[model samples]
Target: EDCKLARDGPPATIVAIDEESRNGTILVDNMLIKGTAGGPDPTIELSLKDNVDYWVLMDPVKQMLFLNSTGRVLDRDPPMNIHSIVVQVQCINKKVGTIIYHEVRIVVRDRNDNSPTFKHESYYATVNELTPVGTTIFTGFSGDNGATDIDDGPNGQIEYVIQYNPDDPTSNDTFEIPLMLTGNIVLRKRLNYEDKTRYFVIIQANDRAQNLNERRTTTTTLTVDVLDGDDLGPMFLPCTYQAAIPNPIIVTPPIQAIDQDRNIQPPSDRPGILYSILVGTPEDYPRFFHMHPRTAELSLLNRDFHQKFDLVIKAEQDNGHPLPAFAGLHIEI
Candidate 1:
């Protein structure tokens, strides 16, 4: 009579396997043939269902199955993904020809090995001072070439953080990353052209894996250029100016008007200061005190200077703006 295996059940026998193992990993070294109790020893053989030959190796001498290598897991071809495979092992009695099957389930475990990288090596963006807060200075991943973290599980996740240095004091409260995963950089507060014209910011990307002894990280440099707006008008150097004119004096010291916008090569006019006497002026003040249109020189038109008077001089830029800066001039003659 031909008897069946005593441990035979509805489903085939199962063996679980973990991927990316240590130096030594054995799957099924000793398989049992249940149908033949007192018969001769049975022969066992192992076969893989899938065509992928990179992950599995069977030892024919010891009748054992184990992981051959972890090259695929370390390289991370698909970034972050779970892997599964199936293998079948059969045991047969040499005399009875009775066969029993066993299935082994292999699951590839994940590891944090790859670093997060940006698409671009460096980024550049421009923002006007008038741009409101929360405005997006540039699109997400503007220069980044679609590169990303290659690790799996939490290690693949990326988070952005702005790196501020003690040297860049003005960047303390200027920009921020509102979203965690999205690479959108927005203005946290209003910008001022006078405060800063250029900003060199460092952005760092960190992985989310916590169990790893050291997290994978990457950094990219960003250049944020601030465009100028007509925020400040012209300003005089000295709040109070003084000049002494007695007689026959040909010229006096010239007053200087400084326009910060002009220094930055503003888009507006060339910023020429128009000088005028505001507080005290004689009927022939224009004739006596000749002020240069562009040089801001308060010259003595005629040496007939005699009297002491308080002159309130006004310095205004020729940028077509009505507002002007004033300086108190005390003329002691």
Candidate 2:
């Protein structure tokens, strides 16, 4: 039954509620206003030990309902970052056959309690070549901070930096601390194991607060091995060099020059200048010869004497002595 239309105001109605669950519920007695007429009261109550979402209804139309301030749906389920809240509801219908019902609830979820992390268990780098004094070897890793107290303030400005290596004073420029600089550390000279052989560098990571901190460091050795090159001047297989070809024969393969310099140290940048090949008569020995510096091939590009030619093909390189070492190929073509 609804409050009759002959009303000067809401009629005095008797309402009673029975608690179904262990927790008591809020009854909808506060929803009566101006012209709203309804059967019983416009609100319903829910009971529970945990948070729940329920509905409110008008007996006449049943669908008209009023929701409380906390309109979110909150349920007592598995994982949660926030606590669920109960929804209080009320409603009223003016013209209708039966009161309609409406429902609302409060819900809360989880938040990030852990920071990001790197996947590498143990990382390794081979020391085939030494990282010079001003060289950046490798980067380090930092784990996320567990939790924070501010709204992304100074305490949240986490950072990372490379610490100096003291084993060798020259190693100060070796490690790169991240987010501080470009995270690159430069070295001026290569690591020399002949001095200490191996080095230990340190790296650290800190929270934005400059107080909370985490760190990781690795140990690796730098090995220095010298490489040797050819040091002996080039020599022919035969003591008396001879290549038999027909008169004015086409020298297509061209004469290839060979030189090996094994005896000189503090090696020359360009080792090909030791010996030269000259052609023609003794006084007018040709300055112009068909010889390719790169391929060391000699062909008669400008033919002077094509028949049984006589020319001295010389090979030269620096021996251990200060004087230039020379080898000559006296060929009969």
Candidate 3:
């Protein structure tokens, strides 16, 4: 009957306990356990293992026990446990020279108090725009905080999810978290460096545990940087040259426009293009024509031509990448 009250009962007259009591929580209401007395007020004492004494305390005056300190349950670092304790009430009657003892049991239950956490405050990763989909660019298993749920069913299971906020929904279909329990994030869609250079993601770890009036969830930030790919070729604007005949005059229009691959900003801070005459000769025609490599300015080096002259001007990107484009330059002498 002493142990039976710990598992099932409605605050029995002899003993009462809260089955699922949290640490620092009251195990029972005051004056709940009343012992039979024949003479003076009965004195009560609680008996528990030496290691468990610090976990709870009994108020002899109020006839109640309260969860005291906190410790591991089932030998866990953060203690969680269900404990049964026996209380002995001794009654002494000097008139009859007799003593009687009554015993009752109290049970203490575990509570869901701890939430899952990550060792690192944030995570970072980098991948090229051409990286294949479903590629595992980051292996996120290293920084796990190693927390175990011991509260109850569904409370011990930890699952990972990408937290998508309606206010900042830029990460719509770019990434995904596979192996929900392992916390692995992978690429879900092809990345475009020009469209988005960086991704700021919010990752959440949620436990099925729910404490009194609260659910358990932890969040972390992840930064993903996208690298550019050489997916585009260079292009050049059309060039037309005109000058007066029999007289040395500067070309009316200059041709110095060239576009880089992808038309996106180059990776390096300093980027430029180089101009050169690939095929501007028709036997002795190069002696009279001159063109600047940097400025693309055409000049009559020696003399003017009496007939039409044709030359091919090549424009090359100078970011250490060899993508050259060509345009025709025609001059009427």
Candidate 4:
């Protein structure tokens, strides 16, 4: 009848709690176990044990409920997500003395409480010089490479970013990660192994937490090794040569050129640059003058056959993809 339990604060049926609630924190207050003044003093006690009973505090004098540290802190892992607490009250003005009863239910759920992590101490990848822009040289932070966050909802969704060392800006703007969630390291610019051989970058994993305080982050090292590529043609030391040919028109230093891409490759793998006469004035100039293919030297086949010569020479680089350059040659014999 008038003996009733009244809830002054939160909803009596459902009380939501986050993991951030500290131990000994009062969950609710002003719980009234109302009774008649003429009747015996009504006592209220918790009726259950071992479930939420291990963590909840039911005070007789304050008529307030608290979450105590007597048990493991309230947690929400993936597999277990529900916590339903039922508090049944038997006003023992004690029992059988009365049959009226009521139950209080509290359901607790999950909140942000996790950190982002990367699997490896460091990641490594290899890229070839001149590898086309937009090439993806390495894949990580997804699947087997392990970038993970266990907190549910937005806190579990992770994003990736690349931070090139500001002091070591040799690699700045050289690479990119297009997708927020993907760990693929992509090339944004053409690489030059001859100029620089290696690059170092830092990949950071950040969770999508709405609260700035709850957002978590982790970083991993990324090392990119550049492989030499055959991307340059032979460059001649001089655009044109002036000379008088003798027994052998020893052009002093000799006609010479260089392979600008010739550094840092295997000794046996480096391509050789050879010179040749691409065009000449006299139809039979080959019969009067000989151009050394390897040495780029001119020898007089018939010293008297031709007095002057105008010629275009080709410097060809021998590689999978051959590149050729040209220069003008003039001689008086």
State each candidate's clash count: 3, 43, 5, 0
**5-99 in candidate 1: lDDT tens per residue?**
33455444455544345534765554333433332552433344442663557654445576655444423336334465666655544565656
Which candidate do you rate higher for TM-score, 1 or 2?
A: 1
Evaluated against the true structure, the overall lDDT of model 2 is 0.36
Ten residues in sequence with the least summed lDDT for candidate 1: 30-39
Listed in order, each prediction's TM-score against the native is 0.60, 0.30, 0.53, 0.66
Error of 1 at 325 (Å): 7.7
Per-residue lDDT tens digits of candidate 3, residues 79-167? 53445665444434334444444354565444455576766778888887889998887766444552345545556567778888454
Q: Each model's RMSD to truth, in Å?
A: 6.7, 15.2, 8.6, 5.7
- Span of ten consecutive residues with least summed lDDT in model 2: 142-151
Clashing pairs in 3: 71-79, 72-79, 72-80, 73-79, 73-80
Comparing 3 and 4 by TM-score, which wins? 4
TM-score of predicted structure 4: 0.66
Candidate with the larger lDDT of 1 and 3? 1
C-alpha RMSD of candidate 2 = 15.2
Residue 15 lDDT in model 2?
31
lDDT of 2 by residue, 141-173 (tens): 323221122212343343444456566554446
Candidate 1 vs. truth: CA RMSD? 6.7
Better of 3 and 4 by lDDT: 4
Top candidate by lDDT: 4
The global C-alpha lDDT for each of the candidates, from Candidate 1 onward, is 0.63, 0.36, 0.60, 0.71
